[PDB]
Amino acid sequence: GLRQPAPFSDEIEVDFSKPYVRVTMEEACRGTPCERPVRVYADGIFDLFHSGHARALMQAKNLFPNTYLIVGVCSDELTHNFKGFTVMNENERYDAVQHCRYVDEVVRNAPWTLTPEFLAEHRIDFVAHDDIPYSSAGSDDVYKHIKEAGMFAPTQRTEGISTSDIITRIVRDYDVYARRNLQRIQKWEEKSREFIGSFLEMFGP
Amino acid sequence: GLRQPAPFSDEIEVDFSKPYVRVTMEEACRGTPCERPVRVYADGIFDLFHSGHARALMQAKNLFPNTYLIVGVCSDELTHNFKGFTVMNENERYDAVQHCRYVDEVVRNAPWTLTPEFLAEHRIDFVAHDDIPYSSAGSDDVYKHIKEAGMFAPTQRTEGISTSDIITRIVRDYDVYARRNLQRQKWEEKSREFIGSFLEMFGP
Ligand SMILES: C[N+](C)(C)CCOP(=O)([O-])OP(=O)(O)OC[C@H]1O[C@@H](n2ccc(N)nc2=O)[C@H](O)[C@@H]1O
Ligand SMILES: C[N+](C)(C)CCOP(=O)([O-])OP(=O)(O)OC[C@H]1O[C@@H](n2ccc(N)nc2=O)[C@H](O)[C@@H]1O
Numbered sequence: 459g460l461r462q463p464a465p466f467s468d469e470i471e472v473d474f475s476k477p478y479v480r481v482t483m484e485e486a487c488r489g490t491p492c493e494r495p496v497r498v499y500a501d502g503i504f505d506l507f508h509s510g511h512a513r514a515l516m517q518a519k520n521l522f523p524n525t526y527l528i529v530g531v532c533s534d535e536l537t538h539n540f541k542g543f544t545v546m547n548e549n550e551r552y553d554a555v556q557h558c559r560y561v562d563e564v565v566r567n568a569p570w571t572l573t574p575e576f577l578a579e580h581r582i583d584f585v586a587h588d589d590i591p592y593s594s595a596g597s598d599d600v601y602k603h604i605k606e607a608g609m610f611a612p613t614q615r616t617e618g619i620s621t622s623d624i625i626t627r628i629v630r631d632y633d634v635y636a637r638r639n640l641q642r643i644q645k646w647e648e649k650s651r652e653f654i655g656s657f658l659e660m661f662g663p
Numbered sequence: 664g665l666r667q668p669a670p671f672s673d674e675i676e677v678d679f680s681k682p683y684v685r686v687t688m689e690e691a692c693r694g695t696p697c698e699r700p701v702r703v704y705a706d707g708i709f710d711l712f713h714s715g716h717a718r719a720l721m722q723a724k725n726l727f728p729n730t731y732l733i734v735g736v737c738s739d740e741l742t743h744n745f746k747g748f749t750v751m752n753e754n755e756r757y758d759a760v761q762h763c764r765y766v767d768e769v770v771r772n773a774p775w776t777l778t779p780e781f782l783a784e785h786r787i788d789f790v791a792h793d794d795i796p797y798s799s800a801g802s803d804d805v806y807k808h809i810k811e812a813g814m815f816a817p818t819q820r821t822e823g824i825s826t827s828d829i830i831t832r833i834v835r836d837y838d839v840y841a842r843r844n845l846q847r848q849k850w851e852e853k854s855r856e857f858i859g860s861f862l863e864m865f866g867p
Contacts, residue, residue: 459732460665460764461724506829508712509755512762520666527664545832550714550824557717559665559764619755624711627750628830629837636838636857640850646841653841 463556467528467565467580480583483608489523496522498611499577500586501530501568503537505544506624507554510616517613518586519560528580529555530568540570540594542662545625571600577609584611593663622658629654668761672733672770672785683783685814691788694728701727703816704782705791706735706773708742710749710865711829712759715821722818723791724765733785734766735773745775745799747866750830776805782814789816827862834858 486496500518504511519527534548544551548567555564569576571594572585589612591599604610633650637643646653691701705723709716724732739753749756753772760769774781777790794817796804809815838858842850 459724459730459767461721461730463721463764506711509758509762512759516666516668516762519664525666545829553714554717557714557721557764559668559762559766561764562664624750625833628833631750632834632837632858632861633841635861636841639853639857639860646845649844649847653844656844657837657840 460559464558464561464564466552466556467563470563472581476581478578478581480609486522486583492524495524495526497526497528497581497583498522498586499528499530499565499572499580499582499584500613501565501572502532502587503541503544503621504529504531504551504555505546506621507551507558508619508621508624510619512558512560513616514586514588514613515558516560518611519562521584521586521611526562527560528563528565528582529558529561530565531555532570533567536570542660545621545661570594571597572604582609585609586611586613588613588615622661625658625661626654629657665764669763669766670768671757672768675768677784677786681786683786686788688813691727695730697729700729700731702731702733702786702788703727703791704733704735704770704777704785704787704789705818706737706777707792708737708746708749708826709756709760710742710751711826712751712756712763713824713826713829715824717763717765718821719791719793719818720763720765723816726789726791726816732765732767733770733787734760734763734768735770736760737773737775741773741775747864749865775799776802777809787814789814791816791818793818793820795820827865830862830865831858834861 481490481496490496498518498521500515515527515529519525531548531551534544537544552564552566555561565580585604587601592601594600601610633654637646686695686701695701703723703726705720707716720732720734724730736756739749742749757769757771760766770785790809792806797806798804806815835858838854
């Protein structure tokens with residue numbers, strides 16, 4: 459079992475007498491020595507941290523026999539810009555992921571698009587996300603180049619769970635509930651369907 | 664690290680050739696030889712599983728040098744009955760806890776009140792929860808009897824976070840957003856009463 463949370467990128471002592479060398483799917487799947495695990499990077503908002511996230515993170519932890527899971531979490535600032543609102547701000551979301559079971563390391567304030575230097579800095583061998591193209595402004599897929607590098611490792615999305623769902627579950631209930639106490643309208647019953655959807659647009663795609 | 668989730672209670676084998684024998688704070692804090700960890704029970708709804716929960720569990724895991732953390736998760740039925748609603752469904756919250764870092768095994772469909780024979784089958788050495796007396800049912804504290812056995816290990820609530828808080832953030836903005844679009848009166852005065860009432864349904 460684990461008694462303590464996951465190290466932030468900062469806490470950890472890293473060595474540049476160690477050159478940057480990735481591994482190959484074959485070399486990684488044959489499985490790595492204990493001193494040299496495979497290093498994988500998964501990224502996201504992780505708003506309303508839930509099972510869908512955690513399973514993806516488990517998928518990611520298990521890609522190879524010996525693996526080190528690092529997880530980039532984006533800032534509120536970057537997220538509100540390119541995506542929509544978070545219900546929970548970055549610190550809560552930083553704390554959340556630290557408590558996940560398969561998480562070795564947390565990377566704060568992580569970049570929307572990944573750069574050669576980020577990958578070199580954090581010594582990343584592969585990258586874990588779902589195989590849908592991510593369109594964030596200017597790009598049809600922001601993982602395209604990581605895919606092309608052969609660096610990309612796809613994952614599977616859990617069904618029935620998502621941050622939109624958790625929001626729509628609540629909002630749907632309050633909508634009818636508020637209006638009910640107002641009675642104690644007709645256009646609302648019509649626009650209720652219209653309002654809720656629009657509301658969740660603000661939270662992304 | 665850990666590549667796999669937490670077992671459930673049933674999913675694991677248990678050998679009853681071992682009689683039920685608890686352990687004192689003393690020889691527990693002295694530390695427990697490997698094959699005999701200390702077994703601690705923490706319980707809750709874990710609706711909207713969050714970091715207040717997760718750290719609560721971390722303390723629980725850390726109460727002793729060698730500690731086995733069992734965590735019970737109460738049913739929708741029990742919860743809707745004795746507490747209020749859950750936006751998360753019992754099967755969802757069963758899954759949530761599985762992915763927590765400090766949790767060795769999960770116990771589905773937990774009791775609202777803990778019983779001698781429940782503590783017997785799960786071989787529970789101690790119990791971790793906050794020291795605020797828990798009043799539901801007719802009990803003004805449901806842990807009092809567990810307290811009195813000296814079997815209780817308190818924990819500390821995190822702050823700024825709780826399952827009720829995540830509701831109000833989401834809720835609030837929508838109360839004002841809807842009304843805003845609505846114009847396309849007097850709701851403002853009552854608005855605070857509304858939200859408050861809405862969160863009463865999920866508990867205190
Ligand atoms: C901004 N990026 C593109 C750099 C990082 C990706 O941003 P994002 O919006 O995909 O982050 P997110 O928090 O929505 O998703 C985190 C990860 O959890 C996975 N996920 C999410 C929800 C869900 N029900 N099942 C999942 O498997 C997604 O595939 C993703 O790989
Ligand atoms: C009903 N019981 C007593 C049988 C089980 C306990 O029910 P509960 O209402 O305490 O469950 P809950 O989900 O509200 O709390 C779960 C656990 O997380 C901890 N917790 C929760 C929120 C928070 N901000 N800080 C915390 O430390 C609580 O101490 C509790 O131990």
